Design a protein around this ligand. Structure first.
Ligand SMILES: Nc1ncnc2c1ncn2[C@@H]1O[C@H](COP(=O)(O)OP(=O)(O)OP(=O)(O)O)[C@@H](O)[C@H]1O
Ligand SMILES: [Mg+2]
Lengths: 385, 94, 71, 101, 71
């Protein structure tokens, strides 16, 4: 209550004062700037004028020439002159030419793409570890290889040897795999890239291999990084025809997935994190340990772990003395954690239909009957074979 | 449908005799109606499956009164129309 | 580069109309069969040009575009 | 007298060395605007003393004078790109009483 | 580029069939030989409404007529 508001007012007396001070000293207080900043801005602007025509650099020559290609088309053999550094010149880069005699007046151009938008993430999850609590020691193997060599460089120099790489998450569904990943990217606060494995198969042919070579050049740049390939099982069935899938498209994705993660390339820091529920279809050139170190195995939790799990979800709901929290856990006999989460979303859906705004012992024992009927109606064994 | 992804499932019934007569009534207002026309008698003759059927009988009757060169849509046109629409749907679904 | 006058929408057209040229050589004597599609085309095409006033006074909308498809 | 002096001066106003329609990709805090001439390639070119780079927002269709590509005015026109995709699809909306029964 | 010219034409063709509504002209007739390449926005209502299928089995009274006019 008060804790939050003291700090929020403290950063709105910082933001206000700094903006008034920093605006006044660019428009009135000029002494280390003044003459010397008015001469440098005047020289660079006059010398190149405007309009400036953006080009794309195909190749450099080291005697200070370049072959640039306009994007319209007409090619040009331009000169590298004045107010330019050759440290940023290189293929693919965007340069400014003077619209009459085209000389490279400088490089400052980087123009964001809608193909680098889909890959990069803006998110900051609203859950952090210990909303996953339970299966406690399964996030305490992903913290030994993702978080821990960044935080303490000391311990991995003290033992020596190369540090771990990667992890695979596989196992029973309803064991939280998707939120486990969404928690190791929020703790560290490293640049978290995120791609589903089903975008790597597209109707277009051989477009697979170009897309994931792109993903890893973006990742190497922002390094240190975490790459989520969520659902790399999906590459096993999703296909649009038999050549947009089939041996053809599945081999192209392997080959690619193999180069990015270990090749001649001599990759910088990409940690990889994969979500999956198929281990017996993966490349045998990845579950080769020594790309991917400790793999994590997940199973349905047991009755005391499911007591820690039902306590995270039931504080959300309205609380009463009537509620029998311990007896929903007991009756369930190694049932997953995705059901426990479908039962507390079902308790406030029955509660709203009544228009009674208390969640009590009656609303939870009714919501368990609806959750056990969908999975049990789909069991058409009836009289046990 | 991994457990906990879906919280509402809306099944859509084929049309009841109260559901078929309320869709038929909204379209009937553009047509002309002379006194004596019950829209409940037409709604019990049909059986429907869909809300495309219930609107296409009323649309078919505005085509018989056009051919006739009759401004008003009176009660012979909806006898012919129920006969064409039900006969058409038994001969494309067979 | 200034708009100094307008031109009729009849003028500067891709194609001269063909209704002023001579009429196609086929008439209804050479149509044989397909008598079932012939009653659905005299209604859809012919009747909304000559008499727009039969559709509107009933309150029905005439069919808009006509598609022909087959082998 | 006013009338014969509207015509004589309208002869000067109708002469245009050239004027394009561009669109603002992105601004830069150099007091320059990156404008895409809409059939061609891109050009970075600063603003005239008629407007500020505070007023120009992303994907705003602007006026350009093809003499040095100097921004004259903001152009009135501009369509949302989503208004475009929703309309070529075309999908009616309804109310609850016309889907009732 | 050749996909971007085909596609600009077709988008323009939908927006001009909309304007064409409420004019005495009966909206464009068009034909296709294989109807299974038909883009979904074109056939959607508001542009095309009627689908005159042209059978090829026909009966014995409608085949006779086709013989009788070529005879
Ligand atoms: N062991 C656990 N501890 C705490 N919360 C859990 C646990 N298991 C599941 N949950 C809760 O269940 C929710 C649904 O899980 P999620 O959708 O991430 O599971 P999943 O195993 O990734 O499913 P899938 O099998 O479809 O890949 C989680 O977001 C999480 O809060
Ligand atoms: Mg998941």
């Amino acid at each position: 209550t008060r804790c939050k508001l003291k700090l929020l007012r403290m950063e709105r007396i910082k933001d206000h004062l700094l903006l008034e001070e920093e605006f006044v000293s660019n428009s009135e207080i000029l002494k280390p700037f003044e003459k010397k900043q008015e001469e440098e801005k005047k020289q660079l602007e006059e010398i190149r004028g405007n309009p400036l025509s953006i080009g794309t650099l195909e190749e450099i020559i080291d005697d200070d020439h370049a072959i640039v290609t306009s994007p319209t088309m007409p090619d040009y053999y331009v000169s590298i002159l004045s107010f330019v550094d050759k440290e940023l010149l290189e293929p693919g880069c965007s340069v400014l030419l003077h619209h009459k005699t085209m000389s490279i007046v400088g490089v400052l151009q980087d123009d964001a793409d809608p193909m680098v938008s889909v890959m990069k993430m803006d998110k900051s999850p609203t859950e952090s570890y210990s909303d996953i609590g339970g299966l406690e020691s399964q996030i305490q193997e992903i913290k030994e290889s993702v978080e821990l060599p960044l935080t303490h460089p000391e311990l991995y120099e003290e033992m020596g040897i190369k540090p771990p790489k990667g992890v695979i998450l596989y196992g029973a569904p309803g064991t939280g795999k998707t939120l486990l990943a969404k928690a190791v990217a929020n703790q560290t606060s490293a640049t978290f890239l995120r791609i589903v494995g089903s975008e790597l198969i597209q109707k277009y042919l051989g477009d697979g291999p170009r897309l994931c070579r792109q993903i890893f050049k973006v990742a190497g740049e922002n390094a240190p990084s975490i790459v989520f390939i969520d659902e790399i099982d999906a590459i096993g069935t999703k296909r649009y025809d038999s050549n947009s899938g089939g041996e053809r498209e599945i081999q192209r994705t392997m080959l690619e997935l193999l180069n990015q993660l270990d090749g001649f390339d001599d990759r910088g820091d990409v940690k990889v994190i994969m979500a999956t529920n198929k281990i017996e279809t993966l490349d045998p050139a990845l579950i080769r340990p020594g790309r991917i170190d400790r793999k994590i195995l997940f199973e349905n939790p047991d009755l005391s772990t499911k007591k820690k799990i039902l306590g995270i979800h039931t504080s959300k709901m309205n609380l009463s003395e009537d509620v029998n929290l311990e007896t929903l856990v007991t009756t369930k006999d190694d049932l997953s954690g995705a059901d426990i989460q479908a039962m507390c979303t079902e308790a406030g859906l029955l509660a709203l239909r009544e228009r009674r705004m208390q969640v009590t012992a009656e609303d939870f024992k009714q919501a368990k009957e609806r959750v056990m009927k969908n999975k049990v109606e789909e069991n058409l064994e009836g009289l046990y074979l | 449908l991994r457990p906990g992804r879906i919280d509402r499932k809306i099944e859509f019934p084929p049309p009841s005799v109260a559901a078929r007569a309320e869709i038929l009534r909204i379209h009937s207002r553009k047509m002309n109606l002379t006194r004596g026309i019950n829209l409940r008698k037409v709604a019990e003759k049909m059986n429907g499956c869909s809300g495309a059927d219930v609107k296409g009988v009323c649309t078919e009757a505005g085509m018989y009164a056009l051919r006739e060169r009759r401004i008003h849509v009176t009660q012979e046109d909806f006898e012919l129309a129920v006969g064409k629409v039900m006969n058409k749907n038994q001969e494309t679904a067979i | 580069n200034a708009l100094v006058d307008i031109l009729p929408p009849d003028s500067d057209s891709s194609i001269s109309v063909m209704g002023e040229n001579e009429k196609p050589d086929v008439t209804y004597a050479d149509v044989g069969g397909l008598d079932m599609q012939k009653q659905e085309i005299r209604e859809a095409v012919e009747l909304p040009l000559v008499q727009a006033d039969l559709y509107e006074q009933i309150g029905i909308d005439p069919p808009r575009g006509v598609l022909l498809y087959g082998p | 007298n006013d009338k014969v002096r509207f015509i004589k001066d309208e002869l000067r106003l109708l002469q245009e060395p050239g004027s394009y329609v561009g669109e603002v990709i992105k601004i830069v805090s150099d007091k320059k605007v990156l404008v895409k001439v809409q059939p061609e390639g891109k050009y970075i070119v600063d603003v005239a003393k008629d407007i500020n780079v505070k007023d120009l927002k992303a994907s705003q269709r602007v006026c350009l004078r093809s003499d040095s590509y100097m921004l004259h005015k903001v152009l009135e026109n501009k369509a949302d790109p989503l208004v475009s995709l929703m309309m070529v699809e075309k999908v009616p909306d309804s109310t609850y009483d016309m889907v009732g029964g | 580029g050749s996909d971007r010219e085909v596609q600009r034409i077709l988008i323009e063709l939908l927006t001009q069939m909309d304007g064409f509504d409420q004019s005495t002209n009966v909206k464009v007739i068009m034909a296709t030989n294989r109807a299974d390449t038909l883009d979904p926005a074109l056939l959607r209502p508001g542009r095309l409404d009627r689908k005159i299928e042209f059978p090829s089995l026909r009966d014995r009274r409608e085949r006779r007529l086709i013989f009788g006019t070529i005879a």
